[PDB]
Amino acid sequence: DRPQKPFDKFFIDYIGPLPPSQGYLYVLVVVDGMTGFTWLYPTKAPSTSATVKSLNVLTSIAIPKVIHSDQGAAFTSSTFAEWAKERGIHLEFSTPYHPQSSGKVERKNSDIKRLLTKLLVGRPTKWYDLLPVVQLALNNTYSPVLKYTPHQLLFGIDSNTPFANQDTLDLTREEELSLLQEIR
Amino acid sequence: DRPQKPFDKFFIDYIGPLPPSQGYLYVLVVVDGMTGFTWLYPTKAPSTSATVKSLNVLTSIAIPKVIHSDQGAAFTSSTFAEWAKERGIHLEFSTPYHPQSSGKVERKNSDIKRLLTKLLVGRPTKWYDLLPVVQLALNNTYSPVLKYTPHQLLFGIDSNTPFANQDTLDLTREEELSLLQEIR
Amino acid sequence: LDAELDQLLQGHYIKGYPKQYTYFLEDGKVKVSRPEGVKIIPPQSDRQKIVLQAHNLAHTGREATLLKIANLYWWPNMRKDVVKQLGRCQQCLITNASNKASGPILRPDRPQKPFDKFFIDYIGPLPPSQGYLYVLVVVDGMTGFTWLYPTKAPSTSATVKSLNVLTSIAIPKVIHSDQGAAFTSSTFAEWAKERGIHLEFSTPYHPQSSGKVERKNSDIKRLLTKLLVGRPTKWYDLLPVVQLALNNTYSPVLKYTPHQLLFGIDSNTPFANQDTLDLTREEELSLLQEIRTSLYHPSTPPASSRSWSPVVGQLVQERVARPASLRPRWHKPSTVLKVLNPRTVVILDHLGNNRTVSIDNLKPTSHQ
Amino acid sequence: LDAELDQLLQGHYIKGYPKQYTYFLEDGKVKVSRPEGVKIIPPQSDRQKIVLQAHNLAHTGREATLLKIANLYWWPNMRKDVVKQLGRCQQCLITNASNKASGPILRPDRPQKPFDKFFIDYIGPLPPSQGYLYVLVVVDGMTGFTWLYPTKAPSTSATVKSLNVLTSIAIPKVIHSDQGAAFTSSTFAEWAKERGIHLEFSTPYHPQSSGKVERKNSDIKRLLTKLLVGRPTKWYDLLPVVQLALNNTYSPVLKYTPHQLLFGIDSNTPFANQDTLDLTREEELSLLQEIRTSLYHPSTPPASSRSWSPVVGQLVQERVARPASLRPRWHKPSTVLKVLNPRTVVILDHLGNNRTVSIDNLKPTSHQ
DNA sequence: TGCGAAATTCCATGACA
DNA sequence: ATTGTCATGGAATTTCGCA
DNA sequence: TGCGAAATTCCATGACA
DNA sequence: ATTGTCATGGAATTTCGCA
Numbered sequence A, B: 001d002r003p004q005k006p007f008d009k010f011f012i013d014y015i016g017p018l019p020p021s022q023g024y025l026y027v028l029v030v031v032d033g034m035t036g037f038t039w040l041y042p043t044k045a046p047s048t049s050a051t052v053k054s055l056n057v058l059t060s061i062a063i064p065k066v067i068h069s070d071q072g073a074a075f076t077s078s079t080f081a082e083w084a085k086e087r088g089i090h091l092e093f094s095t096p097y098h099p100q101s102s103g104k105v106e107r108k109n110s111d112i113k114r115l116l117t118k119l120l121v122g123r124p125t126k127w128y129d130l131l132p133v134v135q136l137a138l139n140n141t142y143s144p145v146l147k148y149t150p151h152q153l154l155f156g157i158d159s160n161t162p163f164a165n166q167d168t169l170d171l172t173r174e175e176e177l178s179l180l181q182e183i184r
Numbered sequence C, D: 001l002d003a004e005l006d007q008l009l010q011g012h013y014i015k016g017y018p019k020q021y022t023y024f025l026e027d028g029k030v031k032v033s034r035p036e037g038v039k040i041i042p043p044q045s046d047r048q049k050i051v052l053q054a055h056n057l058a059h060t061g062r063e064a065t066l067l068k069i070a071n072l073y074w075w076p077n078m079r080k081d082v083v084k085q086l087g088r089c090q091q092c093l094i095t096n097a098s099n100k101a102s103g104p105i106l107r108p109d110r111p112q113k114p115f116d117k118f119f120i121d122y123i124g125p126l127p128p129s130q131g132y133l134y135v136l137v138v139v140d141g142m143t144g145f146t147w148l149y150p151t152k153a154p155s156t157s158a159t160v161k162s163l164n165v166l167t168s169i170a171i172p173k174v175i176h177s178d179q180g181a182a183f184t185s186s187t188f189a190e191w192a193k194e195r196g197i198h199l200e201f202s203t204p205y206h207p208q209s210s211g212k213v214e215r216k217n218s219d220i221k222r223l224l225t226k227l228l229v230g231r232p233t234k235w236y237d238l239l240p241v242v243q244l245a246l247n248n249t250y251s252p253v254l255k256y257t258p259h260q261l262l263f264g265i266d267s268n269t270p271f272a273n274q275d276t277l278d279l280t281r282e283e284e285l286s287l288l289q290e291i292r293t294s295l296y297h298p299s300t301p302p303a304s305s306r307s308w309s310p311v312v313g314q315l316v317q318e319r320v321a322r323p324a325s326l327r328p329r330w331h332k333p334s335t336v337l338k339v340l341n342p343r344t345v346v347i348l349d350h351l352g353n354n355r356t357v358s359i360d361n362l363k364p365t366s367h368q
Numbered sequence E, G: 001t002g003c004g005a006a007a008t009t010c011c012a013t014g015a016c017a
Numbered sequence F, H: 001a002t003t004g005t006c007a008t009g010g011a012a013t014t015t016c017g018c019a
């Protein structure tokens, strides 16, 4: 069997609804299976059109051989199936209620959900502008299992923005009380 | 003594008042002394300003060393004297009431006055447009004394408009009666 | 061509397919183990679609289209098939630039006598001066003698008015001009026929053809510029000064001024040459006839390493004159009807029109 | 200098005046019988006025000014005096064209890694498509990988908006751009400092400095043109198609596409190269590091026969950017402060301003 | 029959938008 | 159914002035 | 050890207005 | 405080296939 490579499988999923930021409410999350590289696109809905609008931007940089998602409406629609067929992208689905991806990916999506949550607390309406810094953080985050960050695995060079400061990602007692105050 | 050359002496004089043609009433006549070449400029008056306006056009092609004229007001004025001084042109005057030029020139000015008269009869108000044809006629007119036309003497080539048809220049009995009819 | 590929799999030789290679079947497709790697040999019936698909990605030329194809396939003489496609892509033919330079310029013989040929052109719009915006430049070909006329527009009416003043001096055999509205008009043709003047026209959008006057346009502007330094651009009153200044200026290569070539004697202008003072006008006119014939004549320069020269029947393309934004810089292929000279040609476009064009406004259609 | 001319008439030798000639007096002026003819020898105290009078007729250069003077006068080393005048005519210095070509172009080293240097520029105005008129072109220097963004104007705001989307992928060390309003703004400098991005700027009115992106502008337009043949110019929807098309196009000299140089592996695009299928991503990334270092690098071409190279202290003149009609194409002489490289220089104009200019926008002031 | 310097000739460069 | 041109100022080369 | 042809490399040309 | 670039298709040159 041939070794794992970038663009072999993109794992897509939606995060949200989030508090509205610049009219946006969701984040489409694209994670390359091999490198663990993350692309985040804000959408106004978890719809096929918003998925197609977002992925059309990504698929102008690189086309994956396979897209992997859960059985969400936006990904199971015949419109999304036609879009992928046109691009020669094979669609792949996890069994309903049983979301399987990969260790690296499951772990990455966890860091994403947590990093977003950490920065949402305090500025829940300013996350639109933060998506570029969140993405750089995620992609310059050292992989204990692979020895390299997703930036290194994808480009084969060190990044000009190394995120050497391995932050908490866990909410402070102050952030906890402030987060439980927002939920009112 | 050095041989006669073009631009050595320009003989200037006014013909008119003529019947108005395109608002013009006079013709300033410039004849090069050596070649017998003729330049005709229509003016609205026999004034210094009209002489200066006309000669400024001619003196943009070639400057004579000497300008010869009678004691006409337009040529004896201090303005005309200043204009010539600026161009390094020496002014020369014939004795009042005794107009002396040169054989060739006196003869040329005669042909001019007669050729104009010939064509005035019938169209006394259309002579403005005829000045270019009158000039070509005059300048492609063979000189019995020199063997060459003024075009040949000035350019040292044959002209593309040779005026081989040596016309009457003398008025027909029909033109005479028509001319004496205008004088009414 | 699955029949052609059948004999191959068996083992018997086919013209084009090297015998030293192992042609096998895998995933229901003929493959070949080549040094570069294992490549699919598609049937001849499929190759056109492949070449076209590869080419259409970025409408790439020969090597860039080949490099894409070669990633997946192999077949005998691939580039022959790439080139057949390139030569049939209308979009590539009308959008791509030439990579072949024109043949070396012609140096037409100097007109023999003054008034044999005039070169006329307009300079402008210029900053308005006394209501005037343009300048009519008339250059005698033999001498270089120039006549300047201020106009309010590059019109037939203003050209006729000006030329009627000029032609009072002498009438020219030919008047050469570009294809400007002012000179191609019927009213102007009528004005010239009426006088025995033959109108000659430059090939369209090729001002080098009017080189004689164009070059004089440069001097007129350079001198006006100088005389107007630190003053408002009031050029109208300078035209006579400039005309006289230039007509009396030495051409270092000829060692004569346009005035001297026209008259054979300087007039009463500063630093007038006195060299023929003791000669008679006849002795002087004789020497002038000798000067006019002995003037330096430039020769055609060496052709560039990659020049192209027109051939009757050659598929050639005319340059689009004022190409709109994001539109092709070239017209569809045309056939060369007659080669007038190595730099001028007669072409027949797809419409069925005869056009006399310069090779500078042409490119030879690639891939024949 | 009537004293200098006195000894001459007497018969005793003066340095410069050939002894073999007969120096006499006539019409109250020193004359000399020369082969060309009898010429007036004016006193040294008169020669400057003469040279200036001759020159001012048509503001002629060396030979044309000399040929006028020589018609009437003679004096030792006339051209030395002609040249002193030419070098002091402000009008000639700011209006005349150069006749010395720039030194041969530099071929700056290719950036070593992707994201080391970006080249940014705007294409437009283009026919309005979806309210958009411009395209922001971002070219990675090492790879050639391009990112296209449609904008409504070449503004700082639109550049920042676009670059914030790009920089989500990776942040560059340097961003090289021209001196367009959009990039020289304080808001843009602030946006870059805030990110550790170093802004580098091209010398003004020299797009060859942004050569990398400029050249990619040509491809983007050529491909849009092709794809829009016989259709309305609706380019907005084509930008992604064009970006992907070009980023995956072979550079025949490199034998690699910008995608391959950036990632070392083709994505799921047509005719994807399969050559490293059996390699691990590490074995693949190792080979990529080797490919990136071994890429062809062009060398500086041979200097033209008549090129000029800058020297500190040399009197040089900057080209007027948007010269008005009938106005000089050159600025007043400047002094070369520092020679940054043989093609870039620092100049101090008459105002007292330091400017970093290209030698392409300079001419060495004639006659020293 | 030859030197050093001045004069002349050569000619690439650029602009006629 | 016509076609490049030529001022410019350094460099190259020829000529001049003297011996 | 050398042929003819195909493949590859070279590189001037032109355009980024 | 900076700097030209590179697709393109004929021509030139090298390599391939065979002996």
Ligand SMILES: O=C1c2c(c3n(c(=O)c2O)[C@]2(CC[C@@H]4C[C@@H]42)N(CCN2C(=O)C=CC2=O)C3=O)CCN1Cc1ccc(F)c(Cl)c1
Binding pocket: C121, C122, C178, C179, C180, C181, C205, C207, C208, C209, C210, C211, C214, C215, C322, E016, E017
């Ligand atoms: O002399 C001209 C010139 C030019 C043009 N026109 C002239 O009459 C004319 O004399 C006309 C005007 C109408 C007629 C069809 C011709 N057009 C078409 C309309 N139009 C535009 O497309 C852009 C301006 C413009 O007027 C020219 O473009 C541009 C080149 N130049 C300068 C030049 C450049 C390079 C050279 F090598 C030489 Cl030698 C000279």
Ligand SMILES: O=C1c2c(c3n(c(=O)c2O)[C@]2(CC[C@@H]4C[C@@H]42)N(CCN2C(=O)C=CC2=O)C3=O)CCN1Cc1ccc(F)c(Cl)c1
Binding pocket: D121, D122, D178, D179, D180, D181, D205, D207, D208, D209, D210, D211, D214, D215, D322, G016, G017
């Ligand atoms: O790419 C450009 C180009 C150009 C210009 N500008 C660019 O930003 C830019 O990118 C700006 C715009 C504002 C900023 C100061 C720069 N201006 C000033 C304003 N202005 C005018 O004076 C005329 C149009 C115009 O925009 C340019 O003229 C023109 C040459 N081209 C094409 C080109 C030609 C030759 C080459 F060799 C190369 Cl590589 C590329």
Ligand SMILES: [Mg+2]
Binding pocket: A013, A070, A099
């Ligand atoms: Mg899920």
Ligand SMILES: [Mg+2]
Binding pocket: B013, B070, B099
């Ligand atoms: Mg009288």
Ligand SMILES: [Mg+2]
Binding pocket: C121, C122, C178, C180
């Ligand atoms: Mg014109």
Ligand SMILES: [Mg+2]
Binding pocket: C121, C122, C207, C214, C217
């Ligand atoms: Mg013109």
Ligand SMILES: [Mg+2]
Binding pocket: D121, D122, D178, D180
């Ligand atoms: Mg720009």
Ligand SMILES: [Mg+2]
Binding pocket: D121, D122, D207, D214, D217
């Ligand atoms: Mg640009």
Ligand SMILES: [Zn+2]
Binding pocket: C055, C056, C059, C060, C089, C091, C092
């Ligand atoms: Zn194509």
Ligand SMILES: [Zn+2]
Binding pocket: D055, D056, D059, D060, D089, D091, D092
């Ligand atoms: Zn001057």
